Amino acid sequence: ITSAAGIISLLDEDEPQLKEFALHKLNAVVNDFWAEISESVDKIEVLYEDEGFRSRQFAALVASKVFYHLGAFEESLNYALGAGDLFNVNDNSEYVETIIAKCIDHYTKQCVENADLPEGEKKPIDQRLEGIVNKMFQRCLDDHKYKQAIGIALETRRLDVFEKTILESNDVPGMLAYSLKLCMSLMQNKQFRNKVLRVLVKIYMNLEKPDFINVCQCLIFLDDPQAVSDILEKLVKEDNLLMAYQICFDLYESASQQFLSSVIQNLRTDQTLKMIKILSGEMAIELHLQFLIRNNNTDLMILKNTKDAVRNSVCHTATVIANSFMHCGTTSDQFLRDNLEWLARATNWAKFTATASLGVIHKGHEKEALQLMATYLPSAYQEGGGLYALGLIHANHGGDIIDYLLNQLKNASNDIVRHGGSLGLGLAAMGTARQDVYDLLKTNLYQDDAVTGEAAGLALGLVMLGSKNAQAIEDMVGYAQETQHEKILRGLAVGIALVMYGRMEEADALIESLCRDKDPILRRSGMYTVAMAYCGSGNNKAIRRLLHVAVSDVNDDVRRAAVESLGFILFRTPEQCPSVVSLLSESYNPHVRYGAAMALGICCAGTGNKEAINLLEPMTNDPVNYVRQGALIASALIMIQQTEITCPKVNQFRQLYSKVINDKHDDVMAKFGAILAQGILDAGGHNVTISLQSRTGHTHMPSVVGVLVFTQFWFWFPLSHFLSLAYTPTCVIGLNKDLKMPKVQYKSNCKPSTFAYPAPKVSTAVLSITAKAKKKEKEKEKKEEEPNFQLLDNPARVMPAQLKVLTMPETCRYQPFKPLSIGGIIILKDTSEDIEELVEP
Amino acid sequence: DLYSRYKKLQQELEFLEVQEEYIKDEQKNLKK
């Protein structure tokens, strides 16, 4: 029966063996009678408290079990850890499972604390805690799949057991890539990110064949230009080349300009010149330009039926940029040449906009562009806009062109010319961190010429983009709270926002200072700065800050910016974005609604979510006009390069755009948003897409920068062309050798059908006798009597959502070597001799 | 997989908490 617990009195004796027997019996019967031993408490504890007792460990185990039954695990862990061996190593009972779970929770919390302060100040860890933790690690390792020990380790830092897990049998190294995914998806500690990446690259290096793609995509985060430079050097000296060519191509497609400049500088300290040429991006830019030119197809019919619908309002400017979006990087000014009287029908800043559109059409033309800009436009507005457009062409790719703009700013009329020249110089020298350009733009800002300073702020932000120069931010803010001309404040807003791009918590004191500043433009700038500093990673602290500002602040502009920052904060996880903004879209004030629409447009890039589309469906009927314009622009941005089979609202939204643009009594801003949406939907001739994410899951800094300064068009129309930096070509290039583009034939896996390029009186009844007449006429009349795939060549455009439905050209003699499951540029593994089919148009 | 589920759940819980806090603030402002 065992219905009594008088054995506890055996602990009250003095002989040791009595206490040992009582402790053993209690441990045997803890699971049932914990009610009585709950009152013993101290009598057991003193047994462990005395050092001279023989079996203090058994007493500690009994007390731990009793406390666990009570529920106060914070002491059950202590008393279990105090006991040794038989305490938990049995790993058999549910009590053991609970104790190990709780103690390893304590261990991981303590590991986080130690990682916070690793400067010797880190608190010590009981060696028994480490022992049970790594015993659990080894048990779950030798037990089954090792994809749980890795997660526990990266939770508790513990890079040693991480390396042990990956370096053990590990089944296949594929899980390593899975770990990499975790390292880039479900962790926000940059300090831990560095160590995890270093471990990953070391593990890649010690393999028989290092995974060059993974190590390069880790080193781009690690910011080690000399490391990847010597990696390329040893790859070349290993007679590999092809993989080095690839690694360079993804390096340019993902890494920042300064990283590539440092890499080429280190390489400068036969094959090496080719390496430098493709690292500078000449070949990549030429290939992208060739793909855009050859695959250019813009439906001028929609532009025709729009240009006859404009009532000579200001919307012409929007059309001026809309076709530009449809002709970005396609060098196709066919509409501009064909329709020229209306091109000249607009002047003042519209001339600036037209020249900017002409330049942005000729995006990435490189050597030709210098004389090309003069050919069409050889008038302060004209020259300023030409300088701005030349800056547009060489976006992040200026080089010697920078020098031109440099001198082209010194000889300026201190007017619109200076504004355009500064904007172009800042755009082209994006992130170059050159001291001379910074000093010249600082002088331009100090000129205090309103519009000139307005452009100088953006230029100084672009040149200092993500630089975190203390001098830069100091001078910028010192001018920010010293000058009038609120336009210059608007420029300096984005200027200081861009200097802190993606820096995370590198300096949040500036965000606090900007949010606490009295000037409303300064608070708007603070929200923009938090958006730029926390791009990608959905840091909930920053999202909470901006939501609180958007809900509590009094200025409508800062609320708009705070809501718009949601896109910049959540583009990496587009699913969460409609959830939060499901109701931001229904505020009592319309500014928050516009911010909600813009955030919806920014966060999900081109995903056919059909949830953001659903939210924007009724909002485009809002009585307020500018919220309708923002909704139209956002719906266009989310719905680029999509069709009816992809989502059932593309044709409906196209005809809605037409029916609002052709309307006459609607607000000018509503039709402005309509034509902007028309330009965005078919932007780039159905050949480019906007995506802040890169191919390898990296954040594309030019894309986010450009979309931010495009959303900054409420205060300045000329900034709209900046959206050009957000487009990425949706192409895959069949380049095998250094200069060969063989006609390799590969198909797709389109299941149901094909998709992609979309589109190119009354009679009265008189029922008296009409029925009889018709029936007798009827008697008189009686008396009278799909593919599933497409063959493609080297410059083949592939939809971003269709990047996984391709087929390996195994039927062809030549098959690629790089994993062909994503867009960009790939390599082709060339088979045996008799190589032919050379294409070079 | 299991760790992925755990991290999904943590992130979703934090996001829901942020949304709830914003709702309480906006309810207060709407009452005002």
PDB file of N, CA and C in Angstrom, chain A residues 780-830:
ATOM      1  N   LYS A 780     -40.031  29.405 -93.842  1.00  0.00           N
ATOM      2  CA  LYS A 780     -39.489  29.701 -95.167  1.00  0.00           C
ATOM      3  C   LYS A 780     -38.007  29.352 -95.252  1.00  0.00           C
ATOM      4  N   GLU A 781     -37.248  29.645 -94.194  1.00  0.00           N
ATOM      5  CA  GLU A 781     -35.833  29.284 -94.160  1.00  0.00           C
ATOM      6  C   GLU A 781     -35.652  27.773 -94.220  1.00  0.00           C
ATOM      7  N   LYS A 782     -36.504  27.031 -93.509  1.00  0.00           N
ATOM      8  CA  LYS A 782     -36.477  25.575 -93.607  1.00  0.00           C
ATOM      9  C   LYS A 782     -36.753  25.124 -95.036  1.00  0.00           C
ATOM     10  N   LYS A 783     -37.690  25.792 -95.714  1.00  0.00           N
ATOM     11  CA  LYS A 783     -37.945  25.489 -97.120  1.00  0.00           C
ATOM     12  C   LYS A 783     -36.717  25.773 -97.979  1.00  0.00           C
ATOM     13  N   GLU A 784     -35.975  26.836 -97.655  1.00  0.00           N
ATOM     14  CA  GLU A 784     -34.810  27.203 -98.455  1.00  0.00           C
ATOM     15  C   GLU A 784     -33.737  26.122 -98.411  1.00  0.00           C
ATOM     16  N   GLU A 785     -33.498  25.543 -97.239  1.00  0.00           N
ATOM     17  CA  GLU A 785     -32.447  24.541 -97.079  1.00  0.00           C
ATOM     18  C   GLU A 785     -32.817  23.219 -97.745  1.00  0.00           C
ATOM     19  N   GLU A 786      -1.375  22.793 -76.768  1.00  0.00           N
ATOM     20  CA  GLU A 786      -0.727  23.847 -75.998  1.00  0.00           C
ATOM     21  C   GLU A 786       0.675  23.429 -75.570  1.00  0.00           C
ATOM     22  N   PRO A 787       1.637  24.333 -75.715  1.00  0.00           N
ATOM     23  CA  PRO A 787       3.025  24.006 -75.382  1.00  0.00           C
ATOM     24  C   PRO A 787       3.242  23.960 -73.874  1.00  0.00           C
ATOM     25  N   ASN A 788       4.392  23.402 -73.496  1.00  0.00           N
ATOM     26  CA  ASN A 788       4.793  23.327 -72.100  1.00  0.00           C
ATOM     27  C   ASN A 788       6.178  23.903 -71.847  1.00  0.00           C
ATOM     28  N   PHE A 789       6.903  24.301 -72.890  1.00  0.00           N
ATOM     29  CA  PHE A 789       8.263  24.798 -72.745  1.00  0.00           C
ATOM     30  C   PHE A 789       8.634  25.571 -74.002  1.00  0.00           C
ATOM     31  N   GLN A 790       9.729  26.323 -73.912  1.00  0.00           N
ATOM     32  CA  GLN A 790      10.214  27.122 -75.031  1.00  0.00           C
ATOM     33  C   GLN A 790      11.720  26.968 -75.155  1.00  0.00           C
ATOM     34  N   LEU A 791      12.190  26.734 -76.377  1.00  0.00           N
ATOM     35  CA  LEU A 791      13.621  26.754 -76.643  1.00  0.00           C
ATOM     36  C   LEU A 791      14.142  28.184 -76.547  1.00  0.00           C
ATOM     37  N   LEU A 792      15.312  28.343 -75.933  1.00  0.00           N
ATOM     38  CA  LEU A 792      15.861  29.667 -75.678  1.00  0.00           C
ATOM     39  C   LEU A 792      17.348  29.687 -76.004  1.00  0.00           C
ATOM     40  N   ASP A 793      17.843  30.884 -76.312  1.00  0.00           N
ATOM     41  CA  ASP A 793      19.233  31.116 -76.659  1.00  0.00           C
ATOM     42  C   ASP A 793      19.974  31.712 -75.461  1.00  0.00           C
ATOM     43  N   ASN A 794      21.209  32.165 -75.694  1.00  0.00           N
ATOM     44  CA  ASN A 794      22.021  32.718 -74.611  1.00  0.00           C
ATOM     45  C   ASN A 794      21.358  33.892 -73.901  1.00  0.00           C
ATOM     46  N   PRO A 795      20.855  34.935 -74.590  1.00  0.00           N
ATOM     47  CA  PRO A 795      20.200  36.028 -73.841  1.00  0.00           C
ATOM     48  C   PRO A 795      18.710  35.765 -73.641  1.00  0.00           C
ATOM     49  N   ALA A 796      18.404  34.830 -72.747  1.00  0.00           N
ATOM     50  CA  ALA A 796      17.036  34.397 -72.503  1.00  0.00           C
ATOM     51  C   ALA A 796      16.499  35.050 -71.238  1.00  0.00           C
ATOM     52  N   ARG A 797      15.346  35.704 -71.359  1.00  0.00           N
ATOM     53  CA  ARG A 797      14.693  36.310 -70.209  1.00  0.00           C
ATOM     54  C   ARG A 797      13.815  35.279 -69.511  1.00  0.00           C
ATOM     55  N   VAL A 798      13.944  35.194 -68.190  1.00  0.00           N
ATOM     56  CA  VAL A 798      13.195  34.240 -67.381  1.00  0.00           C
ATOM     57  C   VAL A 798      12.490  35.005 -66.269  1.00  0.00           C
ATOM     58  N   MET A 799      11.213  34.701 -66.060  1.00  0.00           N
ATOM     59  CA  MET A 799      10.467  35.344 -64.990  1.00  0.00           C
ATOM     60  C   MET A 799      11.077  34.975 -63.640  1.00  0.00           C
ATOM     61  N   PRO A 800      11.148  35.916 -62.695  1.00  0.00           N
ATOM     62  CA  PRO A 800      11.733  35.591 -61.382  1.00  0.00           C
ATOM     63  C   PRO A 800      11.016  34.464 -60.663  1.00  0.00           C
ATOM     64  N   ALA A 801       9.692  34.370 -60.797  1.00  0.00           N
ATOM     65  CA  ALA A 801       8.949  33.260 -60.217  1.00  0.00           C
ATOM     66  C   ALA A 801       9.106  31.970 -61.008  1.00  0.00           C
ATOM     67  N   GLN A 802       9.607  32.046 -62.241  1.00  0.00           N
ATOM     68  CA  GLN A 802       9.821  30.881 -63.086  1.00  0.00           C
ATOM     69  C   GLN A 802      11.287  30.468 -63.138  1.00  0.00           C
ATOM     70  N   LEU A 803      12.097  30.947 -62.193  1.00  0.00           N
ATOM     71  CA  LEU A 803      13.512  30.599 -62.161  1.00  0.00           C
ATOM     72  C   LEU A 803      13.751  29.140 -61.794  1.00  0.00           C
ATOM     73  N   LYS A 804      12.750  28.455 -61.246  1.00  0.00           N
ATOM     74  CA  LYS A 804      12.892  27.074 -60.810  1.00  0.00           C
ATOM     75  C   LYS A 804      12.223  26.076 -61.745  1.00  0.00           C
ATOM     76  N   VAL A 805      11.550  26.542 -62.793  1.00  0.00           N
ATOM     77  CA  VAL A 805      10.853  25.659 -63.717  1.00  0.00           C
ATOM     78  C   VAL A 805      11.630  25.487 -65.024  1.00  0.00           C
ATOM     79  N   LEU A 806      12.923  25.792 -65.022  1.00  0.00           N
ATOM     80  CA  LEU A 806      13.733  25.568 -66.206  1.00  0.00           C
ATOM     81  C   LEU A 806      14.148  24.101 -66.291  1.00  0.00           C
ATOM     82  N   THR A 807      14.682  23.723 -67.448  1.00  0.00           N
ATOM     83  CA  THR A 807      15.184  22.378 -67.679  1.00  0.00           C
ATOM     84  C   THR A 807      16.641  22.443 -68.112  1.00  0.00           C
ATOM     85  N   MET A 808      17.447  21.547 -67.560  1.00  0.00           N
ATOM     86  CA  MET A 808      18.850  21.468 -67.945  1.00  0.00           C
ATOM     87  C   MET A 808      18.957  21.043 -69.404  1.00  0.00           C
ATOM     88  N   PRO A 809      19.731  21.748 -70.229  1.00  0.00           N
ATOM     89  CA  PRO A 809      19.864  21.349 -71.637  1.00  0.00           C
ATOM     90  C   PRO A 809      20.668  20.071 -71.808  1.00  0.00           C
ATOM     91  N   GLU A 810      20.177  18.972 -71.228  1.00  0.00           N
ATOM     92  CA  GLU A 810      20.869  17.694 -71.362  1.00  0.00           C
ATOM     93  C   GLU A 810      20.708  17.114 -72.760  1.00  0.00           C
ATOM     94  N   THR A 811      19.604  17.432 -73.441  1.00  0.00           N
ATOM     95  CA  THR A 811      19.431  16.975 -74.816  1.00  0.00           C
ATOM     96  C   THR A 811      20.474  17.591 -75.739  1.00  0.00           C
ATOM     97  N   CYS A 812      20.905  18.815 -75.447  1.00  0.00           N
ATOM     98  CA  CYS A 812      21.987  19.428 -76.196  1.00  0.00           C
ATOM     99  C   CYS A 812      23.320  18.787 -75.821  1.00  0.00           C
ATOM    100  N   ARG A 813      24.292  18.921 -76.725  1.00  0.00           N
ATOM    101  CA  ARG A 813      25.626  18.396 -76.456  1.00  0.00           C
ATOM    102  C   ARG A 813      26.259  19.094 -75.258  1.00  0.00           C
ATOM    103  N   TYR A 814      26.008  20.389 -75.107  1.00  0.00           N
ATOM    104  CA  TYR A 814      26.583  21.187 -74.033  1.00  0.00           C
ATOM    105  C   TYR A 814      25.578  21.338 -72.899  1.00  0.00           C
ATOM    106  N   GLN A 815      26.039  21.125 -71.671  1.00  0.00           N
ATOM    107  CA  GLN A 815      25.230  21.294 -70.474  1.00  0.00           C
ATOM    108  C   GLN A 815      25.970  22.174 -69.478  1.00  0.00           C
ATOM    109  N   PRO A 816      25.250  22.999 -68.722  1.00  0.00           N
ATOM    110  CA  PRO A 816      25.917  23.952 -67.830  1.00  0.00           C
ATOM    111  C   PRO A 816      26.533  23.275 -66.617  1.00  0.00           C
ATOM    112  N   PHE A 817      27.498  23.972 -66.019  1.00  0.00           N
ATOM    113  CA  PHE A 817      28.192  23.506 -64.825  1.00  0.00           C
ATOM    114  C   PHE A 817      27.699  24.175 -63.550  1.00  0.00           C
ATOM    115  N   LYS A 818      27.455  25.481 -63.587  1.00  0.00           N
ATOM    116  CA  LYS A 818      26.897  26.163 -62.430  1.00  0.00           C
ATOM    117  C   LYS A 818      25.478  25.662 -62.171  1.00  0.00           C
ATOM    118  N   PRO A 819      25.075  25.518 -60.901  1.00  0.00           N
ATOM    119  CA  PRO A 819      23.675  25.176 -60.612  1.00  0.00           C
ATOM    120  C   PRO A 819      22.716  26.166 -61.249  1.00  0.00           C
ATOM    121  N   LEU A 820      21.947  25.701 -62.233  1.00  0.00           N
ATOM    122  CA  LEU A 820      21.050  26.564 -62.997  1.00  0.00           C
ATOM    123  C   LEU A 820      19.647  26.430 -62.412  1.00  0.00           C
ATOM    124  N   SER A 821      19.436  27.122 -61.294  1.00  0.00           N
ATOM    125  CA  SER A 821      18.129  27.208 -60.666  1.00  0.00           C
ATOM    126  C   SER A 821      17.758  28.635 -60.294  1.00  0.00           C
ATOM    127  N   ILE A 822      18.633  29.606 -60.560  1.00  0.00           N
ATOM    128  CA  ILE A 822      18.388  31.008 -60.257  1.00  0.00           C
ATOM    129  C   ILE A 822      18.799  31.844 -61.462  1.00  0.00           C
ATOM    130  N   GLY A 823      18.328  33.084 -61.482  1.00  0.00           N
ATOM    131  CA  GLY A 823      18.659  33.998 -62.552  1.00  0.00           C
ATOM    132  C   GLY A 823      20.070  34.544 -62.420  1.00  0.00           C
ATOM    133  N   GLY A 824      20.407  35.442 -63.341  1.00  0.00           N
ATOM    134  CA  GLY A 824      21.719  36.057 -63.346  1.00  0.00           C
ATOM    135  C   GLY A 824      22.554  35.649 -64.541  1.00  0.00           C
ATOM    136  N   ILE A 825      23.807  35.274 -64.299  1.00  0.00           N
ATOM    137  CA  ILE A 825      24.705  34.798 -65.344  1.00  0.00           C
ATOM    138  C   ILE A 825      25.259  33.448 -64.913  1.00  0.00           C
ATOM    139  N   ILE A 826      25.241  32.481 -65.826  1.00  0.00           N
ATOM    140  CA  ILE A 826      25.688  31.128 -65.539  1.00  0.00           C
ATOM    141  C   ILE A 826      26.827  30.768 -66.487  1.00  0.00           C
ATOM    142  N   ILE A 827      27.434  29.614 -66.226  1.00  0.00           N
ATOM    143  CA  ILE A 827      28.500  29.071 -67.055  1.00  0.00           C
ATOM    144  C   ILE A 827      28.029  27.748 -67.634  1.00  0.00           C
ATOM    145  N   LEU A 828      28.588  27.392 -68.784  1.00  0.00           N
ATOM    146  CA  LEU A 828      28.233  26.168 -69.488  1.00  0.00           C
ATOM    147  C   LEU A 828      29.443  25.243 -69.502  1.00  0.00           C
ATOM    148  N   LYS A 829      29.261  24.018 -69.014  1.00  0.00           N
ATOM    149  CA  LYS A 829      30.331  23.026 -69.042  1.00  0.00           C
ATOM    150  C   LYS A 829      30.458  22.478 -70.456  1.00  0.00           C
ATOM    151  N   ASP A 830      31.549  22.822 -71.130  1.00  0.00           N
ATOM    152  CA  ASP A 830      31.728  22.446 -72.524  1.00  0.00           C
ATOM    153  C   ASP A 830      32.232  21.011 -72.625  1.00  0.00           C
TER     154      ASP A 830
END
